[PDB]
Amino acid sequence: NNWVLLSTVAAVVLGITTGVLVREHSNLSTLEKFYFAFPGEILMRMLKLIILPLIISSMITGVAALDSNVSGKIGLRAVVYYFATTLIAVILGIVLVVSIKPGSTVDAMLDLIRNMFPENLVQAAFQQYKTKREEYKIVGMYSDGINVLGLIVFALVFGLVIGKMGEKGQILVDFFNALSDATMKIVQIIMWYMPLGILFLIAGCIIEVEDWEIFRKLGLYMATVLTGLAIHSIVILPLIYFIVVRKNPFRFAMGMAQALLTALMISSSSATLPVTFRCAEENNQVDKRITRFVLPVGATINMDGTALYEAVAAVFIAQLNDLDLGIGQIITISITATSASIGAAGVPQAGLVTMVIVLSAVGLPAEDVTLIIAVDCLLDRFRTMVNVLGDAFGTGIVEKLSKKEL
């Protein structure tokens, strides 16, 4: 029988029970609380390790497969769908957080473009560029944190060059095609340890909860994120699928249910990629030619739920700080949330790593992310589920939009 979904479901329920029991029956110091989540920490180390080779190989392989000029229309449709759906998600999140009200910008805007074109490839693999005004000259320095956005841009450009280069670049096509397969196999190996890591990751989160009052304080913020993700994944995505594809969207989701369930459990759109491939290709009978580009590329660029979560969380933290947001502040939040979703990886907690960028877009303190850390696991799992669902609908939508080409 299948072991992944079950093992992970058992891990999640065991994590809930372990967290509850340990938090109440026992009293652990900060030390023991940190040491109790060590297996989950090691899982994060392994997943963050696979980020860089996975992204580089996936982007290069995906865009190099679409070598033909006619095949490039498939890529054009995919990128416009990714941007359009992510923009819709950001708009929906901002509107909802403004309505419910649960609670140096140019430097960050230019830092987005600066990080889109890193000065060094090797440095971009593990470092990012940030500029700050001072006396008013601009001083920019590199800080830790993989430059996922710059790596993505170079990988897409490099893969396009390799595909157009023809047989001269066939060695590089094969090199990166094998490197993507090998990285996916390593992710599958990580899947063996994932259940235990997820157990101690979920349990570790519950232990850090102090007196259950923080969930009440963040309940309205949780409601805003959850309602936004729900609307996006149950109305907007099915609706757009119906307009482009004259087929039942909910049947499409039911055919891709195992992938969404796995995403909602492991909270990784890249680790669930094999499941996403299998579901779309087998149950939905989607063409392999468009899937092999839409799914792996969209697993990293197309992150709609993360974009919605970034927008809602940034506005909510601002509202907590009692900083009234103007039109330009809303616009800059929208752009940085779109960039943050693009620049965030498909790993658990990737949402929090790029959250500081959107927070600093409006001058908010970097450490203000701690205001929503406590309830991040539940929101992270859901935003990932919808993240994969966005790509899931894109596969069928791109297939319909490219029927003649295939």
Next chain:
Amino acid sequence: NNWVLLSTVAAVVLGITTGVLVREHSNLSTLEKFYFAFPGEILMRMLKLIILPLIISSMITGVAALDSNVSGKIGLRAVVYYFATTLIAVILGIVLVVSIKPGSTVDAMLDLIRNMFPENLVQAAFQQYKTKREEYKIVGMYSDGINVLGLIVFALVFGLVIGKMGEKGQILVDFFNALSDATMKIVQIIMWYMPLGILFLIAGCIIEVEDWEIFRKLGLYMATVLTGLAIHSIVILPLIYFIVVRKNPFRFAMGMAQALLTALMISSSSATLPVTFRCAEENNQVDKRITRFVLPVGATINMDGTALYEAVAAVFIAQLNDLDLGIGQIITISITATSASIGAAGVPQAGLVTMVIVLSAVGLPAEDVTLIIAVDCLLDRFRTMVNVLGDAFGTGIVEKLSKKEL
């Protein structure tokens, strides 16, 4: 019709007009002055990004093509020509700057050798090694700045090993041959954006000029650099070509005019490399076998005008500081200027990145480079033009010196 040369010439003239008009009619603060050069800044980020893959692939591919022992004579002639002509340029620059007078060394000497053999390959991709006396033990630490010299040495050694390794290393030959072609294609893609970047780079430089008095103060220094570059490119280089090649050198230059013009506009010996290839192969009917090694390798090692500029500028800054230079100080300046030209990339402003090394050779402050920043663009464009011209003459000279081998 051709678009590059024209587009870039229009960009340069538009930059002059934009700079003049903006500097006089309008008054911009330091902030707006920095933000006005942002498109040029992004061009620098893209060009600096391509530095590392371009150099690594170019060196490995160039020296791996000359696999045969007989073919290794071609490489030997090329390297001796590069060193000899660069040494002549340094001597000419030092003599001129001493005559006109426009105005811890062992640690730097040993740091050259230390950086020739970096401790880490990945660190050398983005960091450099420097040692300083203190209490007198020596303390060495790594600092930011790509170790271009160490990467060059490893790439040459690695490429030699790959070429001699025969069919066992053929996969690596092909891998790096495709990687060089792909990097050149990415540079060609950058050429699309270059015109706008050059416009805002030239315009941005003029804005930073305060009251036009700095050009008068540096006029004699500009004259020394310009006369030195002129002499080197119109007397020494044509003369040596005549001794080795019994042909008209100025006709050779007229056949390679489009490459020199493009270099004088874009200020990059590596970005103009496709033009240099086309001119030498088509107009001058130079053999492709020797061109494919002399041009790409010489685009990074053989930088004669930069060597002349480094020597003249280092001595000129010293003269400004009223530090009387001894014989040993002149000798150490010559060696570090040769190393700096070798270690500087083929990008706009590469001359200034390695200038700190030669300045610190004589104990001068690192921030003293600011004394010649204002007039750097004009000198940078000319020194690049002669840089490409040095390689241009080397192609024909190496062909003549290897007539029997071909």
Next chain:
Amino acid sequence: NNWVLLSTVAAVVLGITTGVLVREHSNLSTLEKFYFAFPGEILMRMLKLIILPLIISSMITGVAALDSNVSGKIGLRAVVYYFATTLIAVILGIVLVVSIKPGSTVDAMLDLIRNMFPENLVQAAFQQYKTKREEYKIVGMYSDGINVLGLIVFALVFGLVIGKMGEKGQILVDFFNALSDATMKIVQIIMWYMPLGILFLIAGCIIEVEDWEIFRKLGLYMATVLTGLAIHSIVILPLIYFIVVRKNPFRFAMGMAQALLTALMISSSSATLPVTFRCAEENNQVDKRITRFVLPVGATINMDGTALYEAVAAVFIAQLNDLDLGIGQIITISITATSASIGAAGVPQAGLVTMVIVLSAVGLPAEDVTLIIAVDCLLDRFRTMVNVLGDAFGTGIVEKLSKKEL
């Protein structure tokens, strides 16, 4: 005739004579003492440069050759032998140092596992992770020092994936097979300069000796390390070879004498790898299929003398500090010494780079390594000789244990 062994023997004796004469007849300041060892320093820079490509290619190539499931038994036998013999060495060293008595642990224990799975591949190439308690939250930061252990784990996992991936990963097999051959050729090129570097490395060590009193102070510690290494290489290793292989072990050592002699001279188990290959394959008629995996992999993981030296030196420094070691302290020293031997490279002085980890396991100051630096060269040469001998016996032992498979 052969030049390596002789040239290096002449270099060692010339280093002894140069060190003695320079130390006594002349009086050199700290400056001149440091500058006198510069050629040896450059040798260290070159060898440390080759560490990373050598290890990565060696591990991947070694474990990818054993693609077959039946062939994986060979790898299983090799790894269990490496661990078992290293554990025996650590136990022997601890017992001897406790008997003779020549003189935050959980954080280091968890740091071993954290570094086994680095967060970034590129960062692991040149940086390591360390955590420290403070106010008690845990704060972890990355520091300089190549993460050899994390690179080894990823390389082994990656190579296993590539081997199992079949013909899809054949391009990567060939890429890393050529990269290993090229790296070995570069090491052979370094062998040309090694004699001079070893001369100034040995001479430089003798100069730093102050008044010959430090050797007397560390004489008992030197005796403990030397007796432990002797016992391990003349009793334990020959005995275990006899149990598994019903052949004369000392004849096996006499057949591999040139490799042990070269190791005792150059103090590098990786630079002597070509000699180890030649001796085992020619004189001992060992099968090439098992040698090509046991030797290159064991040159980096299987370091028994280093493990013994790490344990003895850590306990000896602790004894100097008058810190009474409990059972748990001994156990944590044993584990960290095993990890340190695994994580240390096959270069001269690799023992000292990972010594700080085992020292900090028991809270000892990092700079306490200076207490045994003076006499490190002699101990380093011997521990390397036995390091290669451990792998030497493993080749024959693994061959006997896999007779049916071959």
